[PDB]
Each structure stands twice: as C-alpha cells, then as structure tokens.
Amino acid sequence: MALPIIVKWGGQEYSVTTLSEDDTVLDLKQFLKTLTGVLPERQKLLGLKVKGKPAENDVKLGALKLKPNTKIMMMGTREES
C-alpha cells in the first residue's frame, strides 16, 4: 500500500495521502511542497537522510523504511510571487 508522510512548514503540520512506495521521496516532498510547503529551489531539506540512509530523492518511500507519521522539516522562503 501507499506510505503517508507528514510535512511541517513553519508552525503547522500537513499529512500526505496519495504517494506510495512505488514512487520516490522527491515525488512526495515536491508534491506536498507545492500544496503549502516551499520549493527546494529556495528551501532545503533538513533531515534528507534517515536511518543512516541518504534518502536523497531516488529512494523509494518504502525503501527508506520511514514511519507514516514521520514529519518533514523545510527551511527556506516561499516563491517570489
């Protein structure tokens, strides 16, 4: 099945529901980041790595073996528009 993930941008939390292990981390982040999060162009991932793994982007949701509640931090600024 799909693996949900929570993303916190600033002082709030947003649960992701649509991405699956069949996809990749970049597909989930770039997806939520487009909803309320901030693009990577300006912001950078804090804990891009987990469990010693790089979890850069080419990694699959189920490949990182991260929890569903796993929160994602994003440091940066929203687009200039």
The method recorded for this entry reads NMR
CA 40, chain centre distance (Å): 10
DSSP assignments along 7-51, one per residue: EE-SS--EEE-S--TTS-HHHHHHHHHHHTS--TTTSEES---BT
Q: Which of 26, 25, 29 is nearest to 65 (CA)?
A: 25
On whether the CB atoms of residues 6 and 16 are closer than 8 A, the answer is yes
Phi and psi angles of residue 44, each rounded to the nearest 5 degrees, phi first: -130, 145
For 4, the token pair is 């949900």
The gap from C-alpha 69 to its chain's centroid, in whole angstroms, comes to 11
Tokens for 31, please give them.
């997806």
Residues in the chain: 81
Q: Which residues is 74 bridged to in the sheet?
A: 45
Domains of the chain: 1-81 (3.10.20.90)
Residue type, 16: V
Handedness of CA 28, 3, 48, 75 (dihedral sign): positive
